[PDB]
Structure 1
């Protein structure tokens, strides 16, 4: 198959900042590739959340940037994104499994946003995800 898919495992994050009104942070991760968006579950009150959630996103637009954001779920207000990492799709080679910790960028400069642990595998449709 010629159609490519981004297989992304959102494993965990560490050292997230305190951003929620009623304590710590309630983090989830949103993955954006063009018009395609998906998100993890919310982990309650955790600076070192572990999600272990896997996504498979088809590449229909080869120019869309891959944008990964960490967001604080607010049960009584707007959910505020506080950190991101973004990639050109060509930063990943077809067939390569990249298992890495990334330093998160804070939207508000000068604050630490922690790190995120992702497995990213740009794959053809029959390749076993992450293998």
Structure 2
């Protein structure tokens, strides 16, 4: 009872993030959004080279929606502030093709490098073994 297509995504780590987003050292997590489906990694405390090494299975319930990956600064008092992103069209991936690569992140604050993120992405069917 898997979805017809599933994005299997490994969020491995991000390199050279901003160490401060406005004020304080960032406590980053990654949010993955595909339409109204959203899931997130754990928060890594005070790291600009956070390693999550977390694997997701995201069923494709909306074939129109982009795949959005956002890096967010967790704050336990106030608001969590987004500071880096990358967007993919579903058509950028082929079924059965594990894509393992480093992507340049886009910064929410222009004038600031956002670093890079290591993702493994595998669009698969039901009963195709992830990765």
TM-score (norm 2): 0.94
Give the Cα–Cα distance (whole angstroms) in 2 for the partners of residues 2 and 35 of structure 1: 16
Cα distance change, pair 76–2 in 1 and its aligned pair in 2 (3 A): closer
Give the Cα–Cα distance (whole angstroms) in 2 for the partners of residues 32 and 104 of structure 1: 16
> How many pairs align?
130
Give the Cα–Cα distance (whole angstroms) in 1 for the partners of residues 93 and 84 of structure 2: 21
1:55 corresponds in structure 2 to 56
- What residue ranges of structure 1 are gaps of 5+ in the alignment? none
Contact 1:97 1:120 in 2 (8 A): yes
Aligned-partner SS, 1:76: coil
Which consecutive aligned stretches of 4+ in structure 1 deviate over 4 angstroms post-superposition?
A: none
| Displacement of 1:20 | 4.8
The RMSD of aligned alpha carbons is: 1.5
Contact 1:20 1:74 in 2 (8 A): no
Give the Cα–Cα distance (whole angstroms) in 1 for the partners of residues 21 and 111 of structure 2: 18
TM-score (norm 1): 0.94
| Displacement of 1:18 | 2.6
- What residue ranges of structure 2 are gaps of 5+ in the alignment? none
Contact 1:20 1:26 in 2 (8 A): no
| Displacement of 1:23 | 3.0
For residues 66-104 of structure 1, give each alpha carbon's deviation from its aligned partner in whole angstroms, at most 9, with x where no partner exists: 000000001221000001000100000011000010000
| Displacement of 1:61 | 1.2
Cα distance change, pair 52–82 in 1 and its aligned pair in 2 (3 A): same
